[PDB]
Design an enzyme around this catalytic site. Structure first.
Site, mmCIF file in Angstrom:
data_model
loop_
_atom_site.group_PDB
_atom_site.id
_atom_site.type_symbol
_atom_site.label_atom_id
_atom_site.label_comp_id
_atom_site.label_asym_id
_atom_site.label_seq_id
_atom_site.Cartn_x
_atom_site.Cartn_y
_atom_site.Cartn_z
ATOM 1 C CG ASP A 12 10.452 4.710 -8.778
ATOM 2 O OD1 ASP A 12 11.350 5.253 -8.104
ATOM 3 O OD2 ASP A 12 9.504 4.108 -8.265
ATOM 4 C CG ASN A 32 -2.280 0.715 0.987
ATOM 5 O OD1 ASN A 32 -3.324 0.312 1.526
ATOM 6 N ND2 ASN A 32 -2.296 1.780 0.185
ATOM 7 N N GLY A 33 0.604 2.181 -0.880
ATOM 8 C CA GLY A 33 1.365 3.417 -1.024
ATOM 9 C C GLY A 33 0.546 4.516 -1.662
ATOM 10 C CB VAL A 60 -4.015 -1.311 -2.632
ATOM 11 C CG1 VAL A 60 -3.817 -2.531 -1.728
ATOM 12 C CG2 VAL A 60 -4.524 -0.127 -1.815
#
Ligand SMILES: COc1ccc(-c2ocnc2C(=O)NCc2ccncc2)cc1
Lengths: 344, 23
Positions: free
Chosen positions: A141, A29-30, A34
């Site tokens: 990223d 979760n961020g 999710v």
């Protein structure tokens, strides 16, 4: 509970079909959304489901284009339901571990990751980067947390395309991007005309982190990130500043010489790993090796040996199944990357 | 970050980072 949804296959065709899954559990979760772990009812295969609040989703359009052994495959995608709230669900192949967790284990035990795994993980990462960069896609990223691992086979798969973008020259891009410790210096200088070489800087940060047992540049803020870089690379020259961000000017600053690469790492660090790292962590974005050039680096020579094995005794994962797409930046390099024992 | 934006706009990023090296 058994969940049945109408989902569209990730690559083709656009023909939706009923997909059923079970054993649903939250695995992450961020801010993005999710991530769930589930089991497909049909094949008993494990999947990861990334659920994002959803204009077209950039992440989906990128994911639908990719099919590579070092990239987590998009099996299906489905939308779910304020009720104006729409969530996009990406059904991905499940991978149990991350380079983050594996490297943390060795770091906590005060031991370096064996060099064979450093070669295997970094080579697979450069392959995934050669592949996406050939479509003009920049991940933006690259960090150990986004590098998934099958601990038994040593297969690495690049994940989380939530920050990714198809870069187009002359079309500006956000400079505040990439997890801080892995952020290329041109991004710290506020560049908006950067290229896919920002992922190569991040890959060089992962490599150094694997050699050190800790991040090479642990900045405590955006400015402190540049302080951490200068401690190693010294100050950039006026020409390197122009190459990083032609819109940034600084007439006066104290010149700091680079620290020797051989003293950045522990004495027993393989010199070929240091040499490779010196060609990735460069201020000049265009001076950094391309991912395909990094795969062909002599640090990866052990991987091209026919008698190579994992420390567990198993054979290495697939390393030489290169496609025209992946080799597009330099097609003649294929004859160096594909050793005689690997050819048909 | 708001500090970084400021340093980039003022052309004082490298000078300030060099100062923070402490120095
Ligand atoms: C944020 O975007 C994401 C996209 C894909 C994934 C993902 O896709 C396939 N597997 C995973 C995964 O995280 N496995 C490692 C893991 C397994 C069990 N507990 C914790 C971690 C994760 C995040």
């Amino acid at each position: 509970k058994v969940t049945t949804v109408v989902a569209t296959p990730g690559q083709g065709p656009d023909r939706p079909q009923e997909v059923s899954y079970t054993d649903t559990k939250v695995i992450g979760n961020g801010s993005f959304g999710v991530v769930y772990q589930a089991k497909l009812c049909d094949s008993g295969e494990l999947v990861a489901i990334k659920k994002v609040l959803q204009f077209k989703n950039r992440e989906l359009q990128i994911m639908r284009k990719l099919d590579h052994c070092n990239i987590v495959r998009l099996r299906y995608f489905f939308y779910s339901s304020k009720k104006d709230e729409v969530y996009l669900n990406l059904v991905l192949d499940y991978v149990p571990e991350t380079v983050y967790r594996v490297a943390r284990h060795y770091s906590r035990a005060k031991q370096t990751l064996p060099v064979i795994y450093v070669k295997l993980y970094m080579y697979q990462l450069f392959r995934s980067l050669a592949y996406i960069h050939s479509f003009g896609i920049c991940h933006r990223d690259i960090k150990p947390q986004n590098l998934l691992l099958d601990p038994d086979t040593a297969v690495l798969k690049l994940c989380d395309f939530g920050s990714a973008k198809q870069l187009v020259r002359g079309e500006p891009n956000v400079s505040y991007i990439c997890s801080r410790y892995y952020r290329a210096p041109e991004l710290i200088f506020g560049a908006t005309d950067y290229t896919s070489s920002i992922d190569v800087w991040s890959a060089g940060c992962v490599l150094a982190e694997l050699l050190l047992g800790q991040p090479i540049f642990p900045g405590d803020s955006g400015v402190d990130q540049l302080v951490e870089i200068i401690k190693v690379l010294g100050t950039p020259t006026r020409e390197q500043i122009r190459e990083m961000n032609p819109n940034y000017t600084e007439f006066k600053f104290p010149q700091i010489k680079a620290h020797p690469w051989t003293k950045v790492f522990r004495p027993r660090t393989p010199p070929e790993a240091i040499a490779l790292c010196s060609r990735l962590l460069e201020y000049t974005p265009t001076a950094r090796l391309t991912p395909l050039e990094a795969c062909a680096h002599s640090f990866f020579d052990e991987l091209r040996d026919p008698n190579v094995k994992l420390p567990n005794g198993r054979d290495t994962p697939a390393l030489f199944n290169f496609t025209t797409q992946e080799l597009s930046s330099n097609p003649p390099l294929a004859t160096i990357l594909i050793p005689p024992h690997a050819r048909i | 970050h708001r500090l970084l934006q400021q340093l980039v706009l003022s052309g004082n990023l490298i000078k300030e980072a060099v100062r923070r090296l402490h120095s």
